[PDB]
Symmetry: none
Subunit: 153 residues, 2 copies
């Protein structure tokens, strides 16, 4: 079985926000959505068997609360998806809103916060350039370390 569908939530509101994007361990850059629906706050993907990483930020804008999670999303030979969080942290939303301006933030995490859906809009994977330095495994360690060192706050 080839291409399978995978939908993620992507929406910014006054009171909350849900930013979820996929990252191809293969191409080593964010997967491009084949469709996006503002009418629903979703992004759909036409994935081909392989390994992916799903980044997810969830915010309650009013309580300055922010939930960031890194999750492994593998697609079987015949389209059987199997996930598992590999990282989940609970912190402050204002913390991430700073990372945007920190050149010490890993490329993929910087881009991730950058692409975040604008108000009453969905996120948009820009057919982009560049080539992440490390593999997938190290990439997350760079995210982990950085975010935890940002504890400083």
């Amino acid at each position: 079985m080839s291409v399978v569908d995978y939908v993620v939530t992507s929406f910014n509101s006054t009171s909350q926000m849900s930013h979820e994007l996929l990252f191809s361990v293969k191409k080593r850059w964010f997967v491009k959505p084949f469709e996006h629906s503002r009418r629903y706050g979703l992004l759909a993907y036409m994935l081909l068997p392989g390994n992916y990483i799903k980044f997810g930020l969830y915010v309650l804008k009013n309580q300055d609360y922010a939930r960031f999670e890194i999750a492994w999303v593998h697609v079987d030979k015949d389209g059987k998806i199997e996930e598992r969080t590999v990282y989940s942290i609970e912190t402050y939303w204002h913390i991430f809103i700073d990372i945007e301006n920190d050149l010490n933030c890993p490329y993929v995490l910087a881009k991730f916060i950058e692409m975040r859906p604008e108000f009453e809009k969905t996120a948009w994977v820009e057919e982009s350039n560049y080539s992440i330095a490390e593999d997938d495994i190290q990439m997350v360690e760079s995210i982990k370390r950085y975010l935890e060192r940002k504890i400083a706050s």
Copy 2:
């Protein structure tokens, strides 16, 4: 400071369908999910202390059976979730399928029915930041009056 994960089941297969959406008392309308995974047949939220109402519609298509339930979910200021079913009626599915168009069905009930998940899809709460009039106690009570009477 408190924020508790709360997940519900939501899927629509060929043979059956389960539809559970959360209703916030404070905001007086449906809560917004932070995740929609039809892969696991669920919708996941992030709640803050307060009062919520769970609406459940469980259908056995090959029997024209639909169970309707109303639950009282409470979130402690510490985050201790606690809930209880306060209403559960059994009836034909085709009835609900029709109550939907009735001009005098409680709006919150009508919109709930409409929000039922599509095939191999999960329910999707719309940005209808709309506002109801009666408070929870009266809204729940108003739904019962209707369903019961209508049946």
